Amino acid sequence: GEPVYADAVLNGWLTSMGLGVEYVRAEGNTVYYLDDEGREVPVLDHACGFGSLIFGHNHPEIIAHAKAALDAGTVVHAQLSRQPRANQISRILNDIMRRETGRDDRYNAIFANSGAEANEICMKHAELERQERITALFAEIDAELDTAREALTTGTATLDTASLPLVDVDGVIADIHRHNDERRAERPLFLTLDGSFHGKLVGSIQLTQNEPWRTPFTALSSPARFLPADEPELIGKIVEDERRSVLTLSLDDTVRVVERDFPVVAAIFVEPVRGGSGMKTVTPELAEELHRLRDTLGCPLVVDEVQTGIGRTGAFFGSALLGIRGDYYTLAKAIGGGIVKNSVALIRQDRFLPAMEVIHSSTFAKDGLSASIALKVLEMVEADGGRVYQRVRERGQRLEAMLESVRADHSDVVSAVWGTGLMLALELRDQSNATSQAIREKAAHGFLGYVLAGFLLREHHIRVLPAGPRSGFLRFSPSLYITDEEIDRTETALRSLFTALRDQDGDRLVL
C-alpha cells in the first residue's frame, strides 16, 4: 500500500497472469530480464512490439543511422519550412506500390505519430470527400427546386399529390429544406470488418470491435458497422439498411417529391490480415465484396497496413499480396525502425483534396529524426533486389510449418493456424468447459491466452502475447532474423504447453 503513480492495476494483472517481468535490454529477437542473482536471462520475443520489429530490437544499422542523424544536428522541429524528406519517402512508397500492384497510381502522403493518427487522417480526409459530395448534391437539389418552382408558379406543370406523403409550393419546399438540413448534420457511418482493430483514440476506437475497449466511448464519435467477414452474403443487406434519402422536386407536365441517395458512409476500413480477429487474411471473396461496396457507395476504401506493411506478409503491402485495391493506405509500426514513432496516410492523388495539406497538421508529425529513420527502414527492406521479402516468406513458411506440425499433434487444444509471412497465430479451442477449475475460471474471464503466455515465459523463456477478443489466439510475429534453433525451442515450448493443457494441469499453468 505504498504510493503508486502509474501502472498499479496493469502490473497487478500482469503479475497474476505470470507476465510480471521487467526487460532491461533487447537485441535482435531477444529481451533480457534480471534473475534473483542479477544475471541477464535471455527470452525469445515473438510479440516484437505487436509486429513493429521486422528487423528486431535495436538493429545495429538502425541504431547507427539514428546516432548519425543526431550527430549531424538533424532539424527535428522545422514546422512550416520545406522538408523534402516527406516527398522522398512518399516517392519510394509510390514506386513500391506500383511495382507490387502493377497499378500506375500516385499517392499523396500525410505523416503522423501513431497508427491511430494515420487512420484518423484518413477518416478526416474521407469526411472532406463526403462534404464535397454533399455540397454538389445540395447544389443540384437547389437547381431541381428552382426548376420545379418556375414550372409550378408559371403553370407549365402541376404538383402530383400522391408523392406528398414524403413531406402549397413554398411550404412543400421549406419542408424539403428542413428534412434535408436534418439529414445533412447527422453523423456519418464507417464500415469495418468484425474483429477490426484500427486504434483507440476518440475517432478510431469506434472503428475497433473489442467491446470492453469501445462500448464505454460509443456516445463520443461516429460509429462503425462491423460487417461479417465470414458471412459476406449478409454485408449487402446490412449496408442497404443504412441507405438514407434526401428530398427534391422532379420535373417531367407533372412535378413529384422524390427521394435521392444521401452519402452516409465516410469510408470502408480493412486490415489485409485481421489483428483483432487472430491474424485471419482477407479472402478473395471478401476483397471483392469490399470493392463492390467502395464502387457502389463512392466512399474510399482505407487499407490499414499499420501491422501488415513494411514486409511483414512477405510483400511490402499485404493489400498487394491479397488483391485489396484501396483508395487510402496507412503505415506505422516497423517504419520507426523499432526506436522512433512515425506513421503515414497515402491518399490517391485523383481523390486528394489539397485543403488537407494546410488544414491538417501536428507538432511532431514529419519530424527530421523519424523522417531520416523511415528512409533507412525503406532502404533496408528494399535492399538487394527485394531479397528481404524472400527472407520474410521463407522464415514465415518455416514458422507456419512448425505451427501446423504442432496443431496436427495437439488438435484437441489448437483449432487453426492463421496469417501469412511472419504475421501468424494459433487459435486455442474454448476452455470454458475445462476439468481444472483454475483453467476454466481464467478461460471464462477471457484470460486463457495470457495464462498460457505466462507458462511459456517462466518454463521456456519465450515471450508470446495473445490476440483476439477473449485472448483466444497466441500471436507469433518475430523478426526476419528468427533462427531454425529459436523455432525448434518454440516448438518444444508449445508441445510442453499443449501437453499440460491436454492434461488440465491447472497447478502448473495458473499461479
Added chain:
Amino acid sequence: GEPVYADAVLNGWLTSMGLGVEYVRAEGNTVYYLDDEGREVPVLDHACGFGSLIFGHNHPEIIAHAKAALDAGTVVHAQLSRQPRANQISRILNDIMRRETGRDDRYNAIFANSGAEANEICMKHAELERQERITALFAEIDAELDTAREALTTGTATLDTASLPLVDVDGVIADIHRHNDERRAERPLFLTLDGSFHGKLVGSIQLTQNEPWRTPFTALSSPARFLPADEPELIGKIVEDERRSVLTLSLDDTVRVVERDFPVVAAIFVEPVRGGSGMKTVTPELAEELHRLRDTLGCPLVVDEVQTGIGRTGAFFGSALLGIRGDYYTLAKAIGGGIVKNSVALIRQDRFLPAMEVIHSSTFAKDGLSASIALKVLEMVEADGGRVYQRVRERGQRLEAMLESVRADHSDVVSAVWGTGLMLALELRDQSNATSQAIREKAAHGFLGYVLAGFLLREHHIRVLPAGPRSGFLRFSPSLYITDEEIDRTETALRSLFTALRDQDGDRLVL
C-alpha cells in the same frame, strides 16, 4: 510540372509567404539553411517547435543521453511487461506539482505519442466518469419508477395529470424509458474557451476553435461550446442553455412526472496560456469561472499544458503559476527533449477509474527510449535547486521588455504584448484597410503574419511563425539560452519590420 508525392500545396504557399526555405542543421537557438553558394546561413529560431525546444535544438546533454540509451539496448518495445520508468516519471511530476501548488494530491499517468493523444485520453476518461454518473442516475430513476408504480397500483397515491405534458401508469413509464434512452445515447458536450487549441484528431479538432481547421469535421465527433474568455458574465447563460433533463416519477398522496438533471458536459478544457488566442494568459476572474463550472457540473477540468508545461512560463506548471486547479493535466512538447515524441495525461487518483489502465493502450506509448529521455529532461529542468525556472523568468522578462519597448514606439501597427515567461507574442493591428494593395490583399486572406515572418527571414535571418486565427499575432517562444545579443538582433529586426509596415512598403514586404 514534375510528379510530386507530398507537400506541393504547402510548399507553394510557404514559397509565396517568403518562408520557402529548407533548414539542414540546427543547434541551440539556430537553424541553418543553404544560400545560393551552398554556405550555411544561421537563422535565429523564435518558433522552436511551437515551444517544444525550451533547451534548444539538439541540446548536447539530450543527444548524449539518447546516444547512451540506444548503445545500452534500451527496450523500446516491451508492451504488457513491467516498465517502472512510467511510475518514476509520474512520481516526479507528482512531487513537482505538490511543490508548486502546495496541494498534496496524487495523479495517475497514462502516456501517449502527441499532445492531441494526451488530450483524447482525458476526453475518454471524462466520458468514463460520465457513464459512471449516468449508470447511477438511471439506477435511481428505476427505483423512483418502482416506488411510484407500487404507490399507484396499490392505490396509496394518484397520478397528477397536470405533469403529463412532459410525456395510464405502464404507458407513461414506457414513454419515460423511451425519452431517457434517447437522451442517454446523445453525444456529450465539451466546454473550451474561444480561440482554444487542443489538437487536430477526430475528437480533439472539435475542441479547436480555428474555423477552417474544424468546421469540415463537425459531423464526426462531440462538439465543444467555446466560452467567451473576456466576457465571462455570459458563460453562465451559455452552459445553462445546454442543461438537458431526463424524466422520472416523484412520490409525495400524489405522483408527478418531473425532470431531473442529465450529465451532458464530459469535460472543461483550458490552456493556462492560450496558444490559439495569441498567447493570452487565463485571468484570475476566468480561472474562477472555470472552477465554478467544474464544481457545478461535476465534470473534470482538463488543463492542457502541452505548450505551457516543462518550465515555459517560468514554473514547471503554468496552471500552478496562474492558480488553475485542474482535475486532469496534459504534457507533451518539451518532454521529448526536442528529438523524440512523448505525452502524458495526469488524472487525479480520487477520480481515476482503474479500467482505463487496461482498456486504453497504444503501440508506441510508454516506449523505453522516450521514457529515458523524459527522465533526463525532468532531471535538467529540476537541476541546481530550480535555477532553470529562474533563468526562464529572467530571459522571459528581458524578451518581454524588448517586445514592450518595440510596441511603445510602433503602437500604430502593434496592439499588445501577450503571454508570460518565454511564451510571448505581439498582436498586429488589422491591416485589411492598408494603403498598399499587396499588404491589404494578404491581410484580407488571413496571411499578414506569414508575410511579415517572410520579411524577418530574408532581411534579418530570424525565424518567427504567426499565431491566432488570421495570423494576427507573431509568436516568440525561444530556448532559455536566448542571448542578450539575439534579443537585440530581434529588436533591430522588428523596428525595421514595423517601420516598413508603417510606410506601407508592400514591394519590400510582399514578393
